[PDB]
UniProtKB/Swiss-Prot annotation, chain A:
It comes from Comamonas testosteroni (Pseudomonas testosteroni). This is Steroid Delta-isomerase. Pfam families: SnoaL_2. It catalyses: a 3-oxo-Delta(5)-steroid = a 3-oxo-Delta(4)-steroid. Keywords: Isomerase, Lipid metabolism, Steroid metabolism.
Length: 123, 124
């Protein structure tokens, strides 16, 4: 059992870490056997390694990340809505997914699922 | 794989049917071998009859259901922020989950996992 407070605390640390470009910080919320599937329909990315590299390439550009609503948490899972904003060769993109976490006994995240399609990327 | 236009429409039908009390409305969107976890934590309800049972239980009082944001649709999946509101014995309640659908190739919803906690409910 995880406390909704704790699960919710992790989300922010994650959000803050994507904002801070803090790769060590984001990855250390993830179980050794954890997996990132982001966006959905990608083969899931299994293990600390692939997870680290996946967030490393997420950060090549500076990111602006914010929760657009209150985090939902019940049982061992977190869901939240958010925006990722960045600029590349003078063009701005705001991606707006819903992510989903599942936590294990030890407090860490064991799965991540970020759902978003073309209607969810904007300028 | 399914279309995000069809998936995004189906979330609008669902939500529309929960506002009009349309019980046949909401059920028809689901596969026969589908499951409803609402809230995440409880025992799944399985199959058209269990699914029906559940949604008639939800419509015991008039509901005000609305999408609070753009729907996310991809793969054969869709996620949607919403709020459910009702009044009982003077006591207004707002419930603000994040829902999730998974689909089959037939266009029908197989999984539904509504995910909300106590912090996502206000009553006064």
């Amino acid at each position: 059992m995880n406390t909704p407070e704790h699960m919710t605390a992790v989300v922010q640390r994650a959000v803050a870490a994507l904002n801070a470009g803090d790769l060590d910080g984001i990855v250390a919320l993830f179980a050794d056997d954890a997996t990132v599937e982001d966006p959905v329909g990608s083969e899931p990315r299994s293990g600390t390694a692939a997870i680290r590299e996946f967030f490393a390439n997420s950060l090549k550009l500076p990111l602006a990340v914010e929760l657009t609503q209150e985090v939902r948490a019940v049982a061992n899972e977190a869901a939240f809505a958010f925006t990722v904003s960045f600029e590349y060769q003078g063009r701005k993109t705001v991606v707006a997914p819903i992510a989903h976490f599942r936590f294990n006994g030890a407090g860490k995240v064991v799965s991540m699922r970020a759902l978003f399609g073309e209607k969810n990327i904007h300028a």
